[PDB]
Symmetry: C2
Subunit: 517 residues, 2 copies
């Protein structure tokens, strides 16, 4: 394929050594003492936001949390402070922004259009809102309408795309809440922070160094995963499967980018691959009777079923068997109990909903958007990924949590899988926009706008959890990272199934090519 085995194995891992780690520690200490050493309360928020956009805020978590606990005015500062407080799980309602609404009409002032900075800050802060908060929704609408004016008013003057115009373009493309850490980090390092007048060399060097060392760790993990894909022989036994190993690894980079989760990024990778093998087999390769035999064998969960399957079905079923048992083994070694039945039921439910999609296709039935979503958020496999993340990042797990999970999937998990499915259908058997155009009859742009509305509502749903919940803040952030990676992979083109220039360039910039120091 495009990322051949020898090319992956040959990648010179540069940013690794004692000198690199020593420089990283020194720069981290310097940046920490610079962050806590800020005397201006507003400049401290600005520096925190810069560190967040640089992708290095995961190291200074507790320091920022303490600063924000201590931090407990124009529109820009209000929006920035609101976004930070709500981003670190601190309660702060929408009603504050009522200080900027002309309650003679119930809408924000028109002079906001003169403050592009405050409008951009409010636009960025509007995506952290929860369901029921209508002031944030109207603020999102008004700020989008304001930013499009800056687009038609500035970029049309000339290619004088000022750093403000670059940020406006970047926000209109996707808000910071919805973007992943690595892509935004690279973009803010290369295009923005390097051009700022107030730019500090220590922060820039530290961000570049951390990014390149993370790239080197990713390269090592990708070599390991490429050797695994080689010795798995899943390409030979299953010729229909797309060789998208690097794409699943990019998925993992979008999910958990931190260096200490390396092992996870491996396992989940294979999981994605497994899920992909189950996807391509259901919608492209297998027939109805063969997929029915596969789902039956999954229900029975025994190897004597292999005799009643074709060879590719044998390979796929045995791979699923071994991977599910490996998941159960890891859960046993972690939490000290067997849970093979739960993962078996997860896999059987996934294949049940895939077979449901297949039977709907072959029976000629066109489901509504509601039924399609209710079946697809389970037939997309996001629940398996999120349960793997749950049992990998939640410790300890109580009997009450196990009883709550045995009676369905969490709401945050369901809406994250909904976001996953809707983003996957974006840019690509009738699906999401096809069913909505079948039922309501609106145009294609209207259907895609309705799908984006559903995505925004599910994002509000996920935002509700960031506030006694049975899920840690870590797991909530992993679900939101799944959503962000969904919106990152299928943002522009079909980066999962098509090998276009964007699919090359994202992988090059995030994995192979480091940032020039």
């Amino acid at each position: 394929p495009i990322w051949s085995f020898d090319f992956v194995q040959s990648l010179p891992i540069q940013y690794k050594g004692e000198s690199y780690t020593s420089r990283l520690n020194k720069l981290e200490k310097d940046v920490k003492r610079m962050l806590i050493g800020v005397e201006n309360s507003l400049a401290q928020l600005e520096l925190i936001d810069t560190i967040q956009r640089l992708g290095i805020s995961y190291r200074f978590e507790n320091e920022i949390i303490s600063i924000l606990k201590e931090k407990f005015y124009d529109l820009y500062a209000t929006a920035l402070q609101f976004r930070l407080l709500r981003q670190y799980g601190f309660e702060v309602p929408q009603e504050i922004f009522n200080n900027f609404k002309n309650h003679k009409t119930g809408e924000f002032k028109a002079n906001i259009s003169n403050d592009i900075m405050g409008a951009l800050g409010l636009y960025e802060a509007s995506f952290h809102g929860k369901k029921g908060e209508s002031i944030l929704e109207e603020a999102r609408i008004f700020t989008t309408k304001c930013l499009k004016k800056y687009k038609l008013m500035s970029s049309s003057n000339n290619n004088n795309m000022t750093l403000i115009s670059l940020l406006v373009n970047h926000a209109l493309e996707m808000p910071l809440q919805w973007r992943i850490t690595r892509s935004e980090a690279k973009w803010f390092i290369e295009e923005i922070y390097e051009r700022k007048q107030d730019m500090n060399p220590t922060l820039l060097e530290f961000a570049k160094l951390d990014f390149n060392m993370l790239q080197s760790t990713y390269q090592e993990e990708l070599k390991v995963l490429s050797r695994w894909w080689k010795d798995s022989k899943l390409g030979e036994k299953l010729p229909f499967v797309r060789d998208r190993l690097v794409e699943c690894f990019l998925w993992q980079v979008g999910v958990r980018f931190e260096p200490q989760f390396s092992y996870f990024r491996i396992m989940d990778t294979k999981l994605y691959v497994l899920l992909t093998i189950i996807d391509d087999m259901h919608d492209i390769y297998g027939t109805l009777e063969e997929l029915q035999l596969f789902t039956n064998a999954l229900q029975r969960w025994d190897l004597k079923e292999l005799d009643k399957l074709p060879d590719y079905m044998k390979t796929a079923f045995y791979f699923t068997y071994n991977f599910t048992n490996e998941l159960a083994f890891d859960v046993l070694q972690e939490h000290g109990f067997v849970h093979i039945e739960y993962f078996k039921k997860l896999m059987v439910e996934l294949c049940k909903h895939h077979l449901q999609e297949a039977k709907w296709f072959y029976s000629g039935y066109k489901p509504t958007l509601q039924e399609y979503v209710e079946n697809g958020w389970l037939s997309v496999g996001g629940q398996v990924i999120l349960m793997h993340a749950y049992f990998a990042f939640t410790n300890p797990v109580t009997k009450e949590a196990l009883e709550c999970l045995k009676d369905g999937h969490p709401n945050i998990v369901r809406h994250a899988s909904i976001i996953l499915r809707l983003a996957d259908d974006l840019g690509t058997v009738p699906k999401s926009i096809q069913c909505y155009m079948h039922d309501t009859g609106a145009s294609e742009d209207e259907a895609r706008e309705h799908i984006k509305y559903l995505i925004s509502e599910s994002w509000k749903e996920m935002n509700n959890e960031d506030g006694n919940s049975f899920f840690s803040n870590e797991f909530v952030q992993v679900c939101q990272n799944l959503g962000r990676a969904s919106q990152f992979i299928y943002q522009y083109g079909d980066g999962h199934a098509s090998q276009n220039n964007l699919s090359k360039e994202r992988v090059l910039g995030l994995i192979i090519t480091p940032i020039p120091m």
Copy 2:
């Protein structure tokens, strides 16, 4: 442990790059054209023997085979030619050496004691003999008796240990037939070939370069295996298990050292680890009832048995389950058929014989040497290793071979496992020499000499296969490499269970420390 995780991960893999591979290819071409370009027929045999002792003969296999096919006189040349011919599977009986026996008495001439070179060559050639060949046995005896004279006659003059005296010491310690490739290669590079007057720089540089690149590949494999051992958590859940990962990797280096078998060296490693976990649990940790429950669960082969086991038993049983299913998965991906029943029966037989040893221990019964061997060659786990090697190196496998394997284990496999068990008991529940001292009543040195006699007879057994056999030459060589690694690990001290200076030095010289160029 002594080889910590961070130390393994930090190992700077030096001999890797385009320049190293280019130099290797150039030197390999030069050495090949030097080998085939030898005009003297005897000097060609000498160069072939040198390349063999340098450990690089695995690259020039077909060229040497052609030369020896074309090659189809004093005592040294006769012995060298005989050893090479019999080493490459060419039939040449013992009767040739009848040209050196004084058939007035039926014993070799006394003037052989004046030709230390010819005596050493005959000693080296005597170990390639098969059962029934008595002339080679008497030649082995006579040449050992001759070499001990050179020991008491030369090394006693002074520390003028001439290169001849060094070779005599090395041969008396262990013959070349019984030594592994990497250790003999390092020793012949550092102590002997560098000091020869006729030494060629191209051969020396090529041997050192190939050895160091193999060391780098071993370092990468060991990093991967150390990460696997980390994420397996077998040390935490099972505190009784010795952390001998590097020792199992050294075992693999002794079994299959060639660069293209990297993947194998990983899998078999884990297998060894698994076997070790089954060993330490049977003879040290578990009680009779717990091991009985474990063997019962292995027979039933279901996860519902985990509920009827303690936690460490749960971990061990689930690890065995997953590893056996992974073996079956690899065999399916390779040969296109399921064989989970065969590997399950292998594991159940291993645990059956381990439980037999345990029940003999707790019942106070002291078995004879014959019964002990018949139970221990199966309770040592060598058959599992050799079946893994069989299904990894034999392709295709015919129905007749599968029917022959379903009715017991091969003779070569049985005697290789016998060598394994007897060497493991060397230097260490009554065992091999204890049972023989119980039955016959002889002293300890006499019992160990009888054990060495059994080892030599099993070596003759294995030598019989090198001659329509259902096993490829590759598999025969892998079995003999298992035997050589057995005699290499337990040669001097308890390198498996004790962490003495020799256990450090072998690992340092064969893995960490490369040969100075």
